[PDB]
């Protein structure tokens, strides 16, 4: 038993957005206009408190090419995951796109992370159930399980954060005993931002990688599902914002330099 609450908000200032970390009308915005520039096919997989969310991917998927998905914003107090993703979309030119069919699901929590809290606003943790309780957004997601499955195949990256946490880490799958150079680059991405964590859930940590440990989150779901390769990465929520906007946007980056290489 622990006295920190599920249900408590948290909040920062970005200096790169120049707003607050839960402006959800901002951030809608600001990716509005990044899609639009990439050239990025937008599909509504569901909407909650008028909020939609939107799968984004190439405008076809080509079969030559790997297919990854990153997702992010399933917990709304890990609000560095969602701007993350949209700064590593404003550094991203339409030419990615020729080698790899890339997907993105910035934000599945809106209710969440306008609140800033973990929950959405009904009490349900959108990250848990996956097998097929699940929240109100993942019955929506699994309502497209087999377009998900079909983004994910070559690899799937999940941005959170640990939000009581100074030091970072990664959670790993890979068909192999021991981690391999994904999990290890991931790890190493993130590990020029902040120091490394050296238990979750009675598993421990080892070198900042927790490996393949499965449960009912979404990744875990995509790996039984046939994903080749997945991850989901964990930046400091008592580090500075911005800082972990950076590091996030440097994962992404990394993950795909390892599964779609130049
Ligand atoms: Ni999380």
């Excluded at 408590?8 to 990044?34: K, T």
């Excluded at 008592?238 to 779609?260: K, L, P, Y």
Aim: aromatic share 12%; charged share 20%; with cysteine.
């Amino acid at each position: 038993m622990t006295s920190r609450s599920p249900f408590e908000s948290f909040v920062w200032q970005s200096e790169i957005f120049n707003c607050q970390s839960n402006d959800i009308d901002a951030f809608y915005a600001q990716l509005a206009e990044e899609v639009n520039r990439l050239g990025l096919k937008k599909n509504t997989l569901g909407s909650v408190d008028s909020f939609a969310i939107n799968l984004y991917q190439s405008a076809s998927q080509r079969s030559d090419l790997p297919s990854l998905l990153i997702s992010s914003g399933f917990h709304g107090e890990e609000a560095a995951g969602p701007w993350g993703m949209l700064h590593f979309l404003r550094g991203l030119q339409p030419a990615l796109f020729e080698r790899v069919n890339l997907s993105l699901l910035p934000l599945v929590n809106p209710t969440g992370f306008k609140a800033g809290h973990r929950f959405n606003r009904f009490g349900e943790n959108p990250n848990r159930g996956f097998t097929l309780h699940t929240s109100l957004e993942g019955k929506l997601l699994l309502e497209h399980a087999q377009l998900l499955c079909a983004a994910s195949r070559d690899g799937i990256l999940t941005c959170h954060e640990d939000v009581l946490m100074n030091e970072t880490y990664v959670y790993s799958f890979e068909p192999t005993q021991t981690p391999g150079r994904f999990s290890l680059g991931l790890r190493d991405a993130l590990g020029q931002y902040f120091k490394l964590a050296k238990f979750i859930d009675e598993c421990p940590v080892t070198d900042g990688v927790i490996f393949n440990h499965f449960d009912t989150s979404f990744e875990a779901f995509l790996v039984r599902s046939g994903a080749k390769l997945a991850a989901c990465s964990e930046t400091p929520g008592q580090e500075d914002f911005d800082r972990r906007v950076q590091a996030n946007s440097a994962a992404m980056g990394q993950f795909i330099a390892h599964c779609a290489p130049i």
